[PDB]
Each structure stands twice: as C-alpha cells, then as structure tokens.
Amino acid sequence: RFNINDRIKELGTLIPKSNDPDMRWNKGTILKASVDYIRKLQREQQRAKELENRQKKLEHACRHLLLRIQELGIEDFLKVDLRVAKVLSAERVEGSEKLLKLTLSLGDEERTVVAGIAKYYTPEELVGKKIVIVANLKPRKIFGIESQGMILAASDGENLSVIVPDRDVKEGAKLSAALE
Amino acid sequence: HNLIERFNINDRIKELGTLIPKSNDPDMRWNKGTILKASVDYIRKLQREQQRAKELENRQKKLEHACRHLLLRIQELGIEDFLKVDLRVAKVLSAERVEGSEKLLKLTLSLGDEERTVVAGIAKYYTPEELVGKKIVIVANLKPRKIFGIESQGMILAASDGENLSVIVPDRDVKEGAKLSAALE
C-alpha cells in the first residue's frame, strides 16, 4: 500500500512547477498548490464543458456542409474493402457494457469482430443477420479480444443501426460503386 | 509568550475533501488516505479533460481557418489580421444593470439562429431602454470572458472621443447575424 506521505509526493508530481526554480516543496505547500490546482482545473472544466456543447453543434454543421463537397477519387474509394458478412454468433463481453463479440462468416472464412453495438443491439437480434463490415484491417486486440474488421453503422443520434443488403446475397460479396 | 506561532495538514485534507466528488455509496469510508488518493485521481482526470479540451479548441481553430480562407475574395489580400476579427450585427433583446457596478450593463443579444450574453461598459452613457431594440456591432469571436460571474460571449464595440461614448450601428437595416466585411472592388 501507499501511505499519506506517498500520496502527498504524488500530488507533488501532479502540480505545476510554479516556476521560481529555487523554492522547496513541503507537505503543506504541496497541499496548498493541490487545492488551488483543483479549483483552477474546475474552472477550466466549466469552460471546457461550454466549448464541448459548441463542438457538438459544429459537428452537426460539418456533416451538413460535407454534403456540399465532393472531392473523392475512385482509387481512394477502392482503398476500402466493404463486405457482406453473416452473424454466426454474438456474445456480450465481460467488464464492458458497450461491447459485443461477433463471429462472422465471409463465406470461405470466419472473422472475429469486437463491436460497439451492445447498447443498441441484442446478440439474439444479430445472430443470422447479414451486415456490412469494413473487411481489410490488421487484427487488433480490443478489451483482450483480437478483432479483425469494423462494422458499418448509422449513428443518427444516441441510437445505432447496422447496415444490411436489401436482398439476400451470399456472405463474402464485395460492395462496389462501379457500374459493371 | 502564550501563543504558538496558516493551516495544518488535516485542514488542507478536509478542504481537498470538499473539492472531490462523492462516492455515492453510504457504506463508503473517507479517511485521509482515500481523500488524498481520490485527489490524485481527480487531478489526473481533470488534466485529461483539459488536454481533450485543448485538442477540441485547436481543431475548431483549424475549421475557422479553412472557413476564412474559403470566404476569401480575390480583392482582400494582406488584411488577414482584420479578417480574423468576426464583426457581427446583433439585435439587443434585453438590457439590465449589473448589481455592484454602475459602469456595467448585461445585454441579451440576437444573432439570428443563436443568442449571446454580453457585458458592456456603457451603463454611464446608455440606459437599458435606450439600447433595447437596436442593432449594434460586436466582436463575436472573442473568447468567452467571465465578468461579475457573467460569461460574456464576445464583446460590443464602442467609440469614444473623450467626451461622448457611442455604440456602433449599421447605417441601414441589416439582418441580425450579418457578418461585416471590407467593401472593396
């Protein structure tokens, strides 16, 4: 464990140098600077809150104006692999309220994807579903679980919708904007 | 004599206890150790919030930059420090005196889509009834500034010759939220 002096030291490591390279920090002065630093940081938190509200409004504005800019080349789009995939199984992930562990069929192969859909989707809703994923991703550990790929979604608000093919097609089918 | 020679450790720790958030569980035991540890954790949390806020701010600055260089007309060059100032027509919805000051007025302003609260130094020269209903020019993009516990969002413009103080209005009717520009060709 750590004693009172230990934590007062740690508080000493957290606070601002306060310039004036010649002063010595005792317990009481470290605690003084700590109380004051917490108050300062709280004022800052207020300002930051307001700033964040305006930030969300700006995100809205940006999506909408983004509707008005088309600069995307077909090559850059081809840099993404979007695939239809089937849900063989879906599981809740211990310690996480936001996570579902998904087992997906690409046809020939299986993929494991840890997704942020747990609030909006039950494993029973998902199992058997054909959904759209971003297929080309180096595997990465999420919450202790290796995950290959991200699943597409429309966030729309505080809800979520996955993305599905309108008609039934075989898993592994690539999505394309090309005419053929 | 008789007196021992400003606050001790436990007073400071009580204070830190005042500053930190509650556990929300009644069985919880707050001793000096838990208060100090919670203080360390709270400080780190606040620091992370601060850095995140800084990143948000930086990116908003960049969006502002991109927008300003988009708005750019071929006639305006070399004026950038002026273009950075966002001058707006705002309509005064309400004004009231500020308790404790005879200099200050609190103004509620309409920018069109949004409203702003701004503290102005004009109370000596202008009455509330004089200002209400009128369209004035403000600097809208100034960082929010706390004055008398009021957050002033932007500041109004005023001109003084040393004798008289005037606010700044458009010569003709313009819609509130109108952005001011240099008239050039």
DSSP state of B175: -
3 state SS of B43: helix
**Residues 29-58, chain A, touching B (beta carbon < 8 A):** 31-32, 34-35, 37-39, 41-42, 44-45, 47-48, 50-52, 54-55, 58
Angle value at C-alpha B96, between B92 and B102, nearest 5 degrees: 125
3 state SS of B44: helix
Contact predicate A121/A167, CB 8 Å:
no
Q: Which of B137, B22, B148, B114 is nearest to A60 (CA)?
A: B114
**CATH (domain of B169):** 2.40.50.140
Q: Are residues A116 and A160 in the same domain?
A: yes
Distance of CA B94 to the CA centre of its chain: 18
Q: Are residues A101 and A55 in the same domain?
A: no
Nearest-angstrom CA–CA distance, A21 and B86:
41
Q: Which of A129, A128, A92, A86 is nearest to A108 (CA)?
A: A86
**Which residues have a Cβ under 8 Å from the Cβ of B41 and sit 6 or more positions away?**
none
Q: Are residues A54 and A91 in the same domain?
A: no
> What separation in angstroms does the CA of A68 have from each of A54, A73, B65, B67?
22, 16, 18, 14
Nearest-angstrom CA–CA distance, A97 and A125:
17
**For A35, how many CA atoms within 13 A lie in the half-sphere containing its CB?**
16
Q: Domain count of chain A?
A: 2
Question: How many CB atoms neighbour CB B46 within 10 A?
Answer: 18
Two tokens at B114? 């949004």
Q: Are residues A52 and A84 in the same domain?
A: no
Q: Contacts of residue A32 in chain B, CB cutoff 8 Å?
A: 12
Nearest-angstrom CA–CA distance, A67 and A60:
11
Element (H, E) at B155: strand B155-156
Q: Are residues A32 and A111 in the same domain?
A: no
Domain boundary among A46, A65, A84: A65
The nearest CA of chain A is from the CA of B154 a distance in Å of 14
Task: Report resolution (Å) to 1 decimal.
Answer: 2.3
Nearest-angstrom CA–CA distance, B108 and B128:
11
Q: Contacts of residue B13 in chain A, CB cutoff 8 Å?
A: 31
Q: Are residues A55 and A95 in the same domain?
A: no
Nearest-angstrom CA–CA distance, B115 and B123:
21
Question: Residue A93 — φ and ψ, nearest 5°?
Answer: -115, 120
Residue A179 lies in a domain: no
Two tokens at A34? 């700590």
Which of B46, B55, B111 to probe by mutation at the A interface, max A CB count within 10 Å? B46
Q: Are residues A105 and A146 in the same domain?
A: yes
Long-range contacts of A134-140 (CB under 8 A, 24+ apart): A134/A80, A134/A81, A134/A82, A135/A81, A135/A82, A135/A83, A135/A85, A135/A106, A135/A111, A136/A80, A136/A81
Size of chain A, expressed as the number of residues it contains = 180
Domain boundary among A12, A32, A65: A65
Two tokens at B49? 């919030």
- Find where tokens 């997906």 sit: A104
Residue B43 has its nearest CB partner, among A38, A47, A50, at A38
Nearest-angstrom CA–CA distance, B167 and B116:
17
Nearest-angstrom CA–CA distance, B123 and B103:
5
Question: How many CB atoms neighbour CB B183 within 10 A?
Answer: 6
Domain that holds residue A56: 1-65
Q: Are residues A82 and A118 in the same domain?
A: yes
SS3 content of chain B, % helix, strand, coil (to 5): 30, 25, 45
Q: Which residues share a beta bridge with B161? A: none
- The string of DSSP codes covering B91-146 is EEEEEEEPTT-SS-EEEEEE-SS-EEEEEES-TTT--HHHHTT-EEEEETTSPPEE
Residue A180 lies in a domain: no
Q: Are residues A78 and A133 in the same domain?
A: yes
Q: Between helices B9-19 and A27-66, what is the axis angle to 10°?
A: 20
Q: Kindly report the three-state secondary structure assignment for every residue of chain A.
A: CCCHHHHHHHHHHHCCCCCCCCCCCCHHHHHHHHHHHHHHHHHHHHHHHHHHHHHHHHHHHHHHHHCCCCCCCHHHHHCCCEEEEEEEEEEECCCCCCCEEEEEECCCCEEEEEECCCCCCCHHHHCCCEEEEECCCCCEEECCEEECCEECEECCCCCCEECCCCCCCCCCCECCCCCC
Domain boundary among A34, A65, A96: A65
Dihedral sign (CA B22, B23, B26, B30): negative
Two tokens at A51? 């700033």
Q: Are residues A49 and A96 in the same domain?
A: no
Q: Are residues A100 and A148 in the same domain?
A: yes
**CATH (domain of A26):** 4.10.280.10
Amino acid at A87: V
Size of interface A-B (CB pairs under 8 A): 83
Nearest-angstrom CA–CA distance, A40 and B26:
29
- Find where tokens 């809205």 sit: A60
- What method did the depositors use to determine the structure? X-ray
Q: Are residues A61 and A87 in the same domain?
A: no
